[PDB]
Amino acid sequence: LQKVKHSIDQVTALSDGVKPKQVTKNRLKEYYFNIGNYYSIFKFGKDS
Amino acid sequence: VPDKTVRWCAVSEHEATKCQSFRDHMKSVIPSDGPSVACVKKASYLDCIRAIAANEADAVTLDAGLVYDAYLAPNNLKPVVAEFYGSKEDPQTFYYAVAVVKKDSGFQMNQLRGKKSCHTGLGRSAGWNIPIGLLYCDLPEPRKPLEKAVANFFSGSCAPCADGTDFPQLCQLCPGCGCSTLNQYFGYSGAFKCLKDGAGDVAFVKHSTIFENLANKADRDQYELLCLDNTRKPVDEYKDCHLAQVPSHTVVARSMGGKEDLIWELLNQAQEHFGKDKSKEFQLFSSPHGKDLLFKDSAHGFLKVPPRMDAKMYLGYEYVTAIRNLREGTCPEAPTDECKPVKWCALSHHERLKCDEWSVNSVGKIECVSAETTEDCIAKIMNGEADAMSLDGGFVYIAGKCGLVPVLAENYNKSDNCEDTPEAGYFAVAVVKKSASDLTWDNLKGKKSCHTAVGRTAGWNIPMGLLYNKINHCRFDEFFSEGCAPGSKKDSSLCKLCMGSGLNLCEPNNKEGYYGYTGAFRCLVEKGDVAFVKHQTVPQNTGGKNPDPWAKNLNEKDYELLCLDGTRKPVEEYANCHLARAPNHAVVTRKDKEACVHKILRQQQHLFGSNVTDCSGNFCLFRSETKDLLFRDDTVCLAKLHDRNTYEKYLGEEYVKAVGNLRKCSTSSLLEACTFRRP
Amino acid sequence: STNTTDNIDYFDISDESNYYLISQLRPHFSN
Ligand SMILES: *[C@@H]1O[C@H](CO)[C@@H](O[C@@H]2O[C@H](CO)[C@@H](O)[C@H](O)[C@H]2NC(C)=O)[C@H](O)[C@H]1NC(C)=O
Numbered sequence: 001l002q003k004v005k006h007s008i009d010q011v012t013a014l015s016d017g018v019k020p021k022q023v024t025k026n027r028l029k030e031y032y033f034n035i036g037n038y039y040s041i042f043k044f045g046k047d048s
Numbered sequence: 049v050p051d052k053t054v055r056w057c058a059v060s061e062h063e064a065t066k067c068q069s070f071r072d073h074m075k076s077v078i079p080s081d082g083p084s085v086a087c088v089k090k091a092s093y094l095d096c097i098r099a100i101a102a103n104e105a106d107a108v109t110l111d112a113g114l115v116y117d118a119y120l121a122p123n124n125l126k127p128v129v130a131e132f133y134g135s136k137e138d139p140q141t142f143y144y145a146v147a148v149v150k151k152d153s154g155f156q157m158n159q160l161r162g163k164k165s166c167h168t169g170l171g172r173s174a175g176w177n178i179p180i181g182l183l184y185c186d187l188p189e190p191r192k193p194l195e196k197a198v199a200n201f202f203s204g205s206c207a208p209c210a211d212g213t214d215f216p217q218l219c220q221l222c223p224g225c226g227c228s229t230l231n232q233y234f235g236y237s238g239a240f241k242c243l244k245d246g247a248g249d250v251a252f253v254k255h256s257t258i259f260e261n262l263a264n265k266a267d268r269d270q271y272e273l274l275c276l277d278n279t280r281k282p283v284d285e286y287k288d289c290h291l292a293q294v295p296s297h298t299v300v301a302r303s304m305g306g307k308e309d310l311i312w313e314l315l316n317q318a319q320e321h322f323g324k325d326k327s328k329e330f331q332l333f334s335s336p337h338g339k340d341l342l343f344k345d346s347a348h349g350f351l352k353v354p355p356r357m358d359a360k361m362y363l364g365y366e367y368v369t370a371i372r373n374l375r376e377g378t379c380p381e382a383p384t385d386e387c388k389p390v391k392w393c394a395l396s397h398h399e400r401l402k403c404d405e406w407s408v409n410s411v412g413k414i415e416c417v418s419a420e421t422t423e424d425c426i427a428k429i430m431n432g433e434a435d436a437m438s439l440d441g442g443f444v445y446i447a448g449k450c451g452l453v454p455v456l457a458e459n460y461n462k463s464d465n466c467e468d469t470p471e472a473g474y475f476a477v478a479v480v481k482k483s484a485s486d487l488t489w490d491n492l493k494g495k496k497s498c499h500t501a502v503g504r505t506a507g508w509n510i511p512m513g514l515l516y517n518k519i520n521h522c523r524f525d526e527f528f529s530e531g532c533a534p535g536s537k538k539d540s541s542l543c544k545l546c547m548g549s550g551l552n553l554c555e556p557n558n559k560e561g562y563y564g565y566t567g568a569f570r571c572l573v574e575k576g577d578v579a580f581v582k583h584q585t586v587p588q589n590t591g592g593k594n595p596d597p598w599a600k601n602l603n604e605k606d607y608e609l610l611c612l613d614g615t616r617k618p619v620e621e622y623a624n625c626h627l628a629r630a631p632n633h634a635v636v637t638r639k640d641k642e643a644c645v646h647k648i649l650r651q652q653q654h655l656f657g658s659n660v661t662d663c664s665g666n667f668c669l670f671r672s673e674t675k676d677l678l679f680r681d682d683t684v685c686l687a688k689l690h691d692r693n694t695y696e697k698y699l700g701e702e703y704v705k706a707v708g709n710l711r712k713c714s715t716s717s718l719l720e721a722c723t724f725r726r727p
Numbered sequence: 728s729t730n731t732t733d734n735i736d737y738f739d740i741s742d743e744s745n746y747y748l749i750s751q752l753r754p755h756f757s758n
């Protein structure tokens with residue numbers, strides 16, 4: 001439950017924010033792994 | 049809310065670049081749930097120390113002398129991870145300090161005033177503390193402040209991090225004295241470059257940087273290093289011609305906020321990937337942007353500092369004493385006529401009581417400082433609050449390994465020549481009931497036990513050595529069903545069966561009811577199957593020799609001792625079957641106080657010793673109420689030891705071999721610290 | 728009701744470094 005709530009809160013924390021249009025490769029990799037890790041935690045979490 | 053992260057503290061932009069590559073590589077290796085590096089740029093190292101103490105930063109690398117600056121309040125730092133300089137075949141924790149000069153300059157070390165000197169920094173170890181310490185007492189008064197006096201000693205110099213505004217001579221060769229890599233003269237190779245430019249006449253660096261900067265052999269054949277006995281040698285006999293050894297550089301972090309484990313995991317993966325050229329695509333110890341960034345160049349790996357060792361135990365005693373006399377600015381004369389009073393050490397309200405009474409009955413030569421456990425008091429002797437202590441041979445092994453010497457031994461036999469005769473050493477036995485005659489040495493498994501204290505001779509070393517040959521396992525709460533051995537860990541059954549309450553069970557002081565000799569015997573009588581004591585225990589607790597009730601009712605013809613082959617021998621004959629011999633208890637102290645402890649204690653044993661009858665009402669030094677406090681209760685006199693003052697010559701070959709057989713099972717953290725200090 | 732429990736699927740384990748959480752249900756890892 002706590003892991004699901006932390007995931008949804010961090011995704012809304014990303015859903016706030018300042019929006020960039022252009023990104024370098026290394027930081028966009030970290031963004032993709034971050035949000036993919038988040039919803040992956042979610043879709044595991046609701047089943048558990 | 050929010051997860052773990054590691055942050056590092058940076059000095060300049062080169063540290064930010066190297067820290068940036070370090071971030072991307074260490075986020076490349078670790079899984080996404082593991083924490084990564086961050087980079088926080090600060091201007092100087094001292095501002096970085098206050099950045100750690102005010103929790104903006106977590107870790108940063110310092111020298112030894114700078115560790116002494118970071119130790120102080122309100123900073124409250126702690127050394128957590130050191131680094132070794134040798135190959136992985138043999139790690140070396142200390143490194144040398146040398147002074148490189150130009151060929152054919154032709155000047156001695158002693159008359160070195162009025163020359164150009166280049167220092168690697170203010171307060172650093174091989175740059176500042178050793179040269180000013182060796183040159184220190186030759187300067188005239190006023191010596192405080194130090195930078196003014198050294199500024200008048202040389203005719204101008206370079207020393208970064210020194211204050212240019214209050215002292216202009218320290219920046220006379222370096223126009224800005226800046227605590228960063230932006231200064232080209234800052235650092236080891238900056239000081240060697242200060243010699244290589246010819247602007248500096250003498251430089252002070254480690255033994256390896258002249259091998260770092262110069263690749264040609266003739267360039268090495270030019271530059272020379274001066275010796276301490278005013279001679280000259282070339283470079284590669286730095287093991288022959290050095291000034292002093294210093295401890296290595298150390299990653300420091302704060303004490304309460306932590307955290308040691310996370311830094312040590314991260315730097316474990318760092319040392320396993322990047323140290324000894326496993327990867328070409330990134331190096332951790334060398335970098336093209338600059339040298340000595342974030343770490344040293346001559347480092348080859350990281351060693352964990354044990355949790356016991358804080359900064360004063362890390363630097364040693366001579367180094368802290370020298371650096372404190374150098375900060376405070378005092379050249380000791382010490383003519384050595386009279387003796388300052390000895391600060392004896394006690395523990396927990398019975399030793400402290402007795403020690404205070406002896407401090408008043410003596411005219412003032414003895415004063416008392418208390419600790420709680422005996423390991424903590426031995427550490428309190430090492431860093432320097434306490435002078436002398438009497439403790440058994442199993443702790444003369446530990447304290448002797450930590451760097452202390454025994455002076456006077458205890459005698460147990462009454463004679464006219466007891467003060468000079470080296471006695472032989474007492475016997476250790478195991479006492480069993482008469483009510484159980486089925487007990488043999490061949491079968492001790494699953495049956496109860498009683499020990500005096502963890503780490504002692506007759507309670508620990510002599511039993512668990514001879515047992516350790518047979519069991520061949522390092523744990524012991526599996527071989528015994530349960531027992532009593534105070535000083536073990538609280539999860540065990542060994543601390544579970546013991547007596548004291550509340551929260552004082554298994555605590556190794558006199559507040560444990562089953563502690564020590566008489567307490568182990570009371571463990572045997574009340575709840576015990578076998579006990580492990582000295583041979584002298586049963587006639588001293590037999591037959592109303594104690595006014596205590598439980599010892600008043602007992603007799604010795606019941607309580608019998610068992611042998612090694614299994615055959616029960618009666619109590620009066622101990623020599624036919626002793627478990628093993630144990631050396632006498634001895635008084636240990638630091639090496640510099642050996643003469644005053646010797647001269648004072650020989651005076652004190654005459655006035656209050658064993659010839660003083662009418663013991664009740666007046667003072668007796670050795671007689672106690674069978675708590676066996678400050679000294680064993682049956683001591684007659686204390687023997688003067690000439691020619692045998694080390695731990696190994698005092699304890700002897702068979703016993704040192706026995707503890708050496710036990711050595712991989714000892715869990716005392718102070719032994720781990722005093723072993724880690726060794727190279 | 729029933730004196731016994733049908734699903735035994737609540738028992739679980741993760742690695743000792745806490746790097747990965749396993750489960751009894753499909754597909755037993757979040758990654
Ligand atoms: C204890 O001290 C005595 C002397 O105080 C040692 O020497 C002899 O002991 C025997 C008893 O076994 C006496 O009869 C002798 O008179 C003693 N003196 C001599 C021979 O000069 C003794 O060895 C010491 N140790 C023990 C274990 O008793």
Ligand SMILES: *[C@@H]1O[C@H](CO)[C@@H](O)[C@H](O)[C@H]1NC(C)=O
Nearest residue numbers: 653654655656657658659660
């Ligand atoms: C015994 O004690 C007395 C009382 O001070 C002292 O004069 C004498 O030297 C002592 N005897 C010794 C130390 O042999």
Ligand SMILES: [Fe+3]
Nearest residue numbers: 111112173174
């Ligand atoms: Fe250094």
Ligand SMILES: [Fe+3]
Nearest residue numbers: 440505506633
């Ligand atoms: Fe002893």
